[PDB]
Amino acid sequence: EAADEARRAIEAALEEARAAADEARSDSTGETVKKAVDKAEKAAEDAFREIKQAVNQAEKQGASEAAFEAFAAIAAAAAEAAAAAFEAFSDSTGETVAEAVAKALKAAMEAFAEIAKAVAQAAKQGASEAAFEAFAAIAAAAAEAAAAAFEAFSDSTGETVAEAVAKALKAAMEAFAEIAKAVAQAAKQGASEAAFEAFAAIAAAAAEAAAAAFEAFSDSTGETVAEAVAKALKAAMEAFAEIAKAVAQAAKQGASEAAFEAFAAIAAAAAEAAAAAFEAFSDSTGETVAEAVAKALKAAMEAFAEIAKAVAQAAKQGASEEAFEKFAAIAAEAAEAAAAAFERFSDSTGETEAEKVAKELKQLMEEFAERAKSVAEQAKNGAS
């Protein structure tokens, strides 16, 4: 009766979303408003039908009852994210605003369906209940970021502002889907519960940086600033995705607990640096300063991905605990440097000073990645 309670809860979430689609629809009369709402309402339904199917695919493969409790936790977060893409819609009724609203709700829905299928894959691969708790945490983090993207949208109605908002919400969604897939691969590879705890922290660290970039967007509706915010959030998302994949490869290698701890600290160091580059953007609405900001965050999203790929290569070699600590200390030292290049830029918005501090953050990022790679190659030889 466990999968039965899951299907009924799944049908309570789909129903709670259609009512939310109706709750936003009674307060709208423009034709383009009802169009995109019917588009957004059809996107959460094809995702709701895809959730009951994964609840049935793990029934033929009779998963543990922890898989059905994560499917109900994922359906519930699905209903809340549609009601969030609709609560932000309630303050708007323009064509492009509703269009990007439908696009963003379709982005978190396709990401939600992909998470349930990954939960189903681990079910046939009979994972641990720590993977299920990480699945509910990854789904909860997904809802917190889509809702934050909508709240930031509640402050803006610009066509380009809403377009980059939908482009950004899809970026973390595609990043979140890739995280759930890696969680499924390690589930087939039956890794530890320290990996799933770091996976929950990685899902949270993603939400922190996404909400921060949106919080920075709550200060700017200039098309040049919105795209820079969107392209930046995409960089950190592509970074976090690579960090989740690396967290799975060492899980295939079956490493120690200190690795996932440094992986959870690396995801946090990424969040701190991403929010910092956004917090300095809260003091700059010039085009050239905005580009230098997002370009450095791209250089920082590349650096963090390298330091996570390096910590994984030492876990495959079976290294000591001093490596993951030095890896986490390089991640935080990188965060202090990317935050410093942002607060000092808050005292210079001339194009020359912006691209100058940016290029130095790329030179230092390549140096930090060189420092992380040096730490890895030293641990492979058996260093004391």
Residue numbers in the entry: 1 to 384
Authors' own words:
To test this hypothesis, we design helical repeat proteins (DHRs) displaying regularly spaced carboxylate arrays on their surfaces and find that both protein monomers and protein-Ca2+ supramolecular assemblies directly nucleate nano-calcite with non-natural {110} or {202} faces while vaterite, which forms first in the absence of the proteins, is bypassed. To enable exploration of the contribution of the size of the protein-mineral interface while keeping the chemical composition and geometry otherwise constant, we employed Designed Helical Repeat (DHR)39 proteins that can be shrunk or extended simply by changing the number of repeating units. In contrast to typically designed protein surfaces containing a mix of positive, negative, and non-charged hydrophilic residues to promote solubility, and to hydrophobic protein surfaces designed to bind other proteins, we designed surfaces consisting entirely of carboxylate side chains spaced at regular intervals to mimic the carbonate sublattice on different crystallographic planes of CaCO3 crystals (see “Methods”). Here, we describe the design of DHR proteins that template growth of CaCO3 crystals.
Circular dichroism (CD) experiments showed the expected alpha-helical structure, and the proteins were found to be hyperstable, remaining folded at temperatures up to 95 °C. The crystal structure of FD15 was solved at 4 Å resolution and matched the design model with an RMSD of 0.45 Å with a perfectly straight repeating structure having a 8.7 Å spacing between helices in adjacent repeat subunits. In contrast, FD15 did not alter the crystallization pathway from that seen with the no protein and BSA controls.
